Design an enzyme around this catalytic site. Sequence first.
Site, PDB file in Angstrom:
ATOM      1  N   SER A 578       0.829  -1.317  -0.071  1.00 23.53           N
ATOM      2  CA  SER A 578       0.005   0.017  -0.327  1.00 23.53           C
ATOM      3  C   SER A 578       1.168   1.079   0.205  1.00 23.53           C
ATOM      4  O   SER A 578       1.400   1.652  -0.781  1.00 23.53           O
ATOM      5  CB  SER A 578      -0.859  -0.242   1.060  1.00 23.53           C
ATOM      6  OG  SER A 578      -1.678   0.439   1.020  1.00 23.53           O
ATOM      7  N   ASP A 653      -8.394  -5.059  -6.723  1.00 27.90           N
ATOM      8  CA  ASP A 653      -7.929  -3.532  -6.040  1.00 27.90           C
ATOM      9  C   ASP A 653      -8.719  -2.446  -6.006  1.00 27.90           C
ATOM     10  O   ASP A 653      -9.312  -1.550  -6.852  1.00 27.90           O
ATOM     11  CB  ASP A 653      -6.986  -3.773  -5.766  1.00 27.90           C
ATOM     12  CG  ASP A 653      -5.573  -2.649  -4.625  1.00 27.90           C
ATOM     13  OD1 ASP A 653      -6.739  -1.624  -4.171  1.00 27.90           O
ATOM     14  OD2 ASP A 653      -4.184  -3.107  -4.400  1.00 27.90           O
ATOM     15  N   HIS A 685      -7.588  -5.276  -1.908  1.00 29.58           N
ATOM     16  CA  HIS A 685      -6.307  -4.302  -1.710  1.00 29.58           C
ATOM     17  C   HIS A 685      -5.140  -5.189  -1.456  1.00 29.58           C
ATOM     18  O   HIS A 685      -4.596  -5.131  -1.565  1.00 29.58           O
ATOM     19  CB  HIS A 685      -7.362  -3.525  -0.596  1.00 29.58           C
ATOM     20  CG  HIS A 685      -5.465  -2.513  -0.634  1.00 29.58           C
ATOM     21  ND1 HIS A 685      -4.622  -1.655  -2.012  1.00 29.58           N
ATOM     22  CD2 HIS A 685      -4.971  -2.085   0.315  1.00 29.58           C
ATOM     23  CE1 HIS A 685      -3.723  -0.830  -1.341  1.00 29.58           C
ATOM     24  NE2 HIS A 685      -3.556  -1.817   0.210  1.00 29.58           N
TER      25      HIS A 685
END
Lengths: 707, 707
Positions: A578, A653, A685
């Site tokens: 991330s 995602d 994600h």
Amino acid sequence: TKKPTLEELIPGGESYLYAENLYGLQWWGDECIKPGVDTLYSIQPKTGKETMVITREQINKVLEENKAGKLSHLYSVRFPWTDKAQMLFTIAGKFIVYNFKNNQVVSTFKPKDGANNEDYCAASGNVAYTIDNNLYVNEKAVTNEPEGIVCGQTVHRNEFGINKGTFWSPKGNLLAFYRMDESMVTQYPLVDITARVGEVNNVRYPMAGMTSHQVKVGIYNPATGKSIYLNAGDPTDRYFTNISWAPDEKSLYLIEVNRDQNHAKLCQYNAETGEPMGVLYEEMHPKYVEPQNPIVFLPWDPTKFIYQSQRDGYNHLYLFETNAANMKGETYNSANGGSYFQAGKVKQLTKGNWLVSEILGFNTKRKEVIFTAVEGLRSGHFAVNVSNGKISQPFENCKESEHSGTLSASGTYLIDRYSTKDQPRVINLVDTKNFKETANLLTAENPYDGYQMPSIETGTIKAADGTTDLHYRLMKPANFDPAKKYPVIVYVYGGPHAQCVTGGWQNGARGWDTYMASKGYIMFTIDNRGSSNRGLTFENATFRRLGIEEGKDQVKGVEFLKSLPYVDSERIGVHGWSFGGHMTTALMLRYPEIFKVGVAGGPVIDWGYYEIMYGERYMDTPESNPEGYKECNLKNLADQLKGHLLIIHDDHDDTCVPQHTLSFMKACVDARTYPDLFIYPCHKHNVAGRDRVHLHEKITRYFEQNL
Amino acid sequence: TKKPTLEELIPGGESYLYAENLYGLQWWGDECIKPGVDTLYSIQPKTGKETMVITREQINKVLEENKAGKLSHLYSVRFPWTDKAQMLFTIAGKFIVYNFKNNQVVSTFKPKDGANNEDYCAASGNVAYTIDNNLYVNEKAVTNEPEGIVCGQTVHRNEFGINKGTFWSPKGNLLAFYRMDESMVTQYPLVDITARVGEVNNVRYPMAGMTSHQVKVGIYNPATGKSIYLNAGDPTDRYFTNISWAPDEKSLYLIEVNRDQNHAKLCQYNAETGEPMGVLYEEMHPKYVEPQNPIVFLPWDPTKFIYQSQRDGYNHLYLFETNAANMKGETYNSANGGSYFQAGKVKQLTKGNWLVSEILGFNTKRKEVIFTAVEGLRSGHFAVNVSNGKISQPFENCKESEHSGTLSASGTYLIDRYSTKDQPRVINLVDTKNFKETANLLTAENPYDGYQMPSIETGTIKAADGTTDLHYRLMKPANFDPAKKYPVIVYVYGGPHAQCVTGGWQNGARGWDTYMASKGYIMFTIDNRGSSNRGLTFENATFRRLGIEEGKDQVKGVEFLKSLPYVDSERIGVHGWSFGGHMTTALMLRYPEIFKVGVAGGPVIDWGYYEIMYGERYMDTPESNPEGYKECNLKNLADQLKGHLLIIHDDHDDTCVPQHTLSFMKACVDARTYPDLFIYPCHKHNVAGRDRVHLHEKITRYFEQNL
Ligand SMILES: [Mg+2]
Ligand SMILES: [Mg+2]
């Protein structure tokens, strides 16, 4: 001699090891309830004496006489009435109210099929829930809205502490709810490759600098079946956050934040007409203001409430007057470099270089607010007398630990869940008069007992500013020899709202950390400026240049490692997910002579593809910060790749659209650089479930082949 | 000592080396025209004497007097009139007719902006072209059709020899065109990641066993401006192929193929009304029938035409009567195991274990049809007298070579372009009376002169059937030592309509073959059963089980390599694209003990994701062949992956949808196997341009690291 495998260390693993816990542990007034698979016990907090309440056989006997179903365990029961000897549970979507002194089913209610976000109000017996994009109360639909309108659900992409979209009045007679119009937001096309013919799965995704969604607050009366909407004006480019009710249910409060996120307003609205009733307080900051908590009224005095603010640099409690909108307001400068517009007498209840992480509730008899406080690796539970401001004990008495708490109905006792470096899970009952343990409910044993385990060390080094102290965690293999040279893998996150190095169990080490350390790799993690639980100054040092000061601090961590004689300086790898994915890529591109191998998962590549709410807070708009967006757009540095970089992205995602990674691939093709790629189809994600093991084997394999 | 780079060996490379050529070499009647950058020469074929016709300066002088523009070279000029001393060229979309005797511009015509698929008819001066999905003739729109309707363009995904959708009448008074309705075909969502927000780029893609598109044939009269459509009935599940005109322009012929592709019909239609006029011939086969060529009428006798058929096992010429639909028809069995329904006298003009690859045209005076014939690595040009069937010379006189030809207007001379193992390009003028060279126009020099080059060897081995001979090509590094052990890379295609090992230049070796052979890798390619230019029996051996017999034959190739003492049996890799990508994946999964490393580009993984037209021909439908589809679905073998497999797929691939590779990744994740992946964004089936060098560096790098 035996080492744990990824099946025992990664959540989703077939034999995943975790420390023992007490699930469903809660309060029935001032009695502690300990559920089990077959029994429910009651614990007297003063003494610690356990009393049996009921067995699952007893409850199931009564459920079968009512043809209401069967319970598999008693872990999912709730006790929302302090004064009624009643229990609440669900069996196949059906709500059952059970009397445990008479052994009788009191009532059953089955919401419509496909019910989500169920919010039960114990005071009125009403239940609000959603079916697709519409809101329901009991058997009736509150809304009948088309595609693009979402009612009674979370808004502003879960920012400003928003986690739900239903807010029951204190006595349960009115329901406040969100109504979001997303019709004007761009749809991002995700593609489902499991369909007969690959189908589009569109998601609304508002990108930095583009058209945002519009939010409205509705008020529904279950007795009349009619709803009103707060008359706030044109909702375009405005955030409606932290909805809170007046104790008398006559007015509603919220905190409004502008699109530039530098100006917050505490607003009151009439609950019957939806008309505005004034602004009680305003908070401004040249960088940003981030309200995350609603106001809490004193249970003994509705003329006063607690507001949570970081205006002095740390999240602290402030006691305000309800009549503030109808008093004389003055502007003041705040210690964080901001300003505020305040009326009436305001009292700062908590102060110091630490922050309040949670308001646990109140002790009404002693007129105290009970709360959790944190700073760096330290945590603890505290009380402050609202009248004089006397704190139970100074924050300095805190040890390195991770505390969590649940307060009893009278605020006399607390369920204290904590962990320390070597203690996986400790659960005690605590007296809130002197904060003394009254009984030990659990002292979990180490789940890795009988395994070979790596060593864990924590310390501090100075940030790239030369003054700020950064916490780091260092892990070594069990058979560590300081005469040999070892490869290093830096695990990085480094973004806001997160902290990697904790005072809790294994100082926050993750399963893959343990796995690689036991494979002969030194593991290193440093919490850079920008990360949480260190105050606002530590956090906003990265404003308008995300990743830059973070990288500088990660490089100070590497300069520390290079100063250790057992570190092979020519074998430094890096991994993150991330924000961590952005950091992994940025470190490979900005310091190509330092980092040799990198693995980046679901990264942010260009902040112009990232969501408005989170993005514009730290980066402003692409039009307002063209230099920041150019500098932090990793496609611009594609030609700098010298080492081995693997980018993993998930095809579904909707946090970091897959466009990030594929647009980076195109930039490398053009620049003639050779990164590697992997796509996990049908994952959001993060890779969840059994495939998370596949993910960590692929990451391990990449480092073994190239580092 | 110097070795060529990927920039010199790969098309798209900055310094790509290629053998010299003569562009625009054509016929003006029976005079050979040799264009240049600054001059146009005329060559007398009998003698070989070169005569200057015109200079670019002369033409540009006249173009500037007409404000018509400027030519940069004379390579794009055409001479479509035998009797007029006129030329045709285009300057920035503007068509110019130029007289080269008087140096005058005869006419100019500029079609509407965005014109594609321009089809000029020299006999009438009319030009047909398309703008988006609609057809235009001269200044007028023939069609005004919505989204989902495509007019005047290729249909049935370029199958059955369809390469355009406009067909002018012999004298240019009528235009036959295709009208395709695709509205009912499923759209596959490709995603453009270069847009501000990743957008969907839908493509119509009909998958095996699903709803197909519908085709209609229109006839447009440019003098009336009106169109009629052939009244063929419901076009659902029918192919309309090989459109041909009657010499008098009164009727149109086509070959209709059913959805099962095992029954073909030669049909006549009235050009004025669109009414059917009968079926002249029918061809059937239990496996498949594949018409690829229209019928050609004899220029001296319109009561007879040549039909091209493989009914005896090889593509051969058959002389039919025009009045066949109005005669008595009988059913016959054919040597290929099929059957046919024939009326009238039919004469087989060509016969033998070889096939006709092209009808070059006719010698009207001598009553001969001139044609190219091929088999395996052998090629040549031939004439057959249509009256008595006497062939110019037996096919056995052919040498190993790759011949291409262009016949003069009288059929007296031929432009012969060929290549052999060591001759890159030879261009001669040939007398079609005795097929003797009359003049050498070019004998290209080796473009790799002064470079270190690998050795090339060809031979044969027996197929997995023990009787069929398979051609292979073996390449070794220049410094080859038969005392040392070498790694091997098998380059595979192996699908129908293609042949890898040729009698032409370097026996069909590709740039990357040359590159890896010079890097110390033995390169090997074998043309397995299923490949082309060997007859129908060699080809349809793979029917209903694509990849199976192909794999067996590739393994016979490996068993040959393993019998060579300089081959390291433990270091065998494999690489292919498209069908070859399927083959690379299949070989890795079915023979995991043989291939150590594989690179598969844009592969077919599951035939159920592949197009109706090509797919159903060899595999029938998923409903008709459930066993074939299960066996050849590589997702079913995902758990067999032991070695290093890299799958490369292009994000805008509309030949093999990206679903193939992503569904294969999902199957490996589930089976816990670890293939690698790469996506080239903004590329179609194949990576074209400068990025093709990036592709071959990535492929080289994968084999260097893992083989
Ligand atoms: Mg701002
Ligand atoms: Mg068939």
